[PDB]
């Protein structure tokens, strides 16, 4: 909940993981913090980009190898800002009923970024509150971005999230999900 509590959690649970990463694993994590690399990696995994470039293939391989060695040390609640475009296949776009999303499973084919800190205003019209169970394939990332305060938990590809409840107000949608 607190940044201090988030940083202690990250150190206690991911110090061994981080000091055991190869140089190419570290570079792939740093590269992912570059929005240009982010778009190329997640674009391909999601299918918005059809062609697989060898260099993108290598970055994805090294990031996935890194996160495959990581596991959440306990159950934690994480946060993610996103867009309603991820829900468009689940809705009647001319008769929007967000309550009918309850029970649907969202899949993220790419890497999934989350933050441990809820006391922030996210960019976009969907906020997700994620109940992440112990043992999930995510890693706390400290000192990997150019933002020293960044409190990030990055999940490996293919996470699935079951929608448990929905709140809507002025086109701003809050979604509570269980990470499967």
């Amino acid at each position: 909940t607190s940044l201090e509590e988030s940083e202690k959690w990250g150190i206690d649970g991911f110090s061994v993981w981080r000091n055991s990463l190869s140089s190419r694993e570290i570079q792939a994590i740093r590269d992912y913090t570059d929005i240009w690399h982010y778009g190329n990696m997640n674009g391909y995994l999601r299918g918005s980009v059809e062609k697989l470039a060898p260099d993108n293939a290598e970055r994805i391989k090294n990031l996935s190898s890194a996160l495959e060695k990581a596991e959440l040390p306990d159950n934690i609640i994480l946060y993610r800002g996103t867009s309603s475009e991820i829900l468009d296949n689940f809705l009647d776009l001319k008769n929007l009923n967000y309550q009918n999303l309850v029970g649907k499973t969202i899949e993220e084919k790419g890497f999934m970024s989350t933050t441990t800190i809820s006391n922030q205003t996210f960019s976009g019209n969907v906020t997700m509150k994620i109940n992440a169970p112990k043992g999930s394939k995510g890693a706390y990332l400290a000192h990997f971005s150019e933002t020293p305060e960044e409190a990030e938990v990055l999940f490996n590809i293919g996470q699935k999230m079951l929608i448990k409840e929905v709140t809507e107000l002025n086109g701003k949608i809050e979604i509570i999900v269980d990470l499967l």
């Binding site: 997640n42 809705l91 996210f122």
Partner: protein, 332 residues
């Protein structure tokens, strides 16, 4: 703050998931329509009774127009010409320009030659070439109510995207139709088709999409010049088209016959292949009725129901997919 570098991702995510949403609908809509055109070209103008004895089950060649298997016609060509024009934004003068290039120079033909173009279409484009403005060159006669506008406007639904409001849709659908088909009966037909296709784009089940279109058209197009034209659309707009029998379905190039037939073929079948083969085997304007049906079934059932056997026989398949991807990119 603690979100840090993750804050930037949301705008990229929005763009990427918009690409996927559009691609999932656009590619099977285009391929589904084009395949219907290909299936029907070699039997255009053949009678229904001949087709009952010799039904289309696959792409055949060297019938009407003496073309190879997998050859699409003006329906697909003018659809591609509209996609090309829209990439840099809606501009009615670029739209008509590309249509003239199809007619004159074989722009977006399968082998470089125009083997067919409709008469209303040709007469209207020839008027534009001579100085008649794009708002006055379209045919207005009672017998100018062919289906040549409805066969070339499906890209407008994708251009509108998740703008489901009335105003822009109402304007551009009329403007683009009127280039060739300026009679209010034809314009009303365009609104019917666009509304149904938009409702399927929006993820409605097919019967709801149909029912919502009926209410919408009656609500918005009951004043002059459309009030007097609604009667010709009674089988579509009043009651259940899907209760009609084949013997009640007419499959000429008349815009009313064509919309009745294509929507009926879609509502009374349960797969893409069933829909387009049912449409083609009505005889008459087989390529166009099957193109329209294939646009509706394609967007509804999506790529898993479009036979790969048919996709691979389409002339210039790779160029069509490249145009689809360039169009999708322009909509983001």
């Amino acid at each position: 703050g603690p979100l840090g570098s993750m804050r930037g991702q949301e705008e990229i995510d929005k763009e990427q998931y918009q690409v996927l949403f559009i691609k999932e609908r656009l590619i099977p809509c285009v391929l589904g329509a084009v395949i219907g055109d290909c299936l029907g070209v070699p039997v255009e103008f053949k009678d229904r009774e001949y087709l009952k004895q010799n039904p289309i089950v696959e792409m055949i060649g060297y019938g009407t127009y003496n073309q190879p298997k997998g050859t699409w016609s003006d329906d697909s060509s003018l659809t591609f010409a509209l996609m090309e024009s829209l990439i840099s934004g809606y501009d009615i003068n670029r739209i008509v320009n590309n249509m003239v290039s199809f007619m004159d120079d074989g722009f977006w033909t399968p082998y470089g030659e125009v083997f067919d173009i409709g008469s209303v279409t040709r007469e209207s484009l020839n008027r534009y070439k001579n100085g008649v403005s794009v708002f006055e060159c379209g045919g207005k006669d009672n017998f100018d109510n062919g289906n040549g506008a409805i066969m070339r406007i499906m890209p407008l639904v994708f251009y509108l995207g998740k703008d489901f409001s009335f105003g822009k849709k109402n304007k551009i659908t009329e403007e683009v139709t009127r280039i060739t088909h300026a009679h209010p009966r034809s314009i009303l037909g365009s609104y019917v088709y666009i509304e149904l296709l938009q409702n399927l784009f929006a993820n409605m089940d097919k019967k709801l999409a149909y029912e919502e279109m009926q209410n919408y058209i009656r609500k918005n197009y009951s004043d002059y010049p459309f009030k007097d034209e609604l009667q010709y659309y009674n089988n579509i707009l009043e009651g259940n088209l899907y209760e009609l029998k084949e013997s009640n379905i007419k499959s000429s190039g008349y815009v009313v016959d064509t919309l009745e037939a294509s929507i009926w073929a879609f509502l009374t079948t349960n797969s893409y292949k069933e829909a387009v083969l049912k449409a083609v085997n009505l005889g008459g304007d087989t390529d166009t009725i099957a193109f329209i049906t294939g646009s509706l079934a394609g967007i509804y059932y999506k790529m898993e129901q479009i036979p790969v056997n048919w996709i691979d026989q389409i002339a210039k398949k790779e160029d069509i997919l490249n145009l689809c991807n360039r169009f999708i990119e322009s909509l983001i």
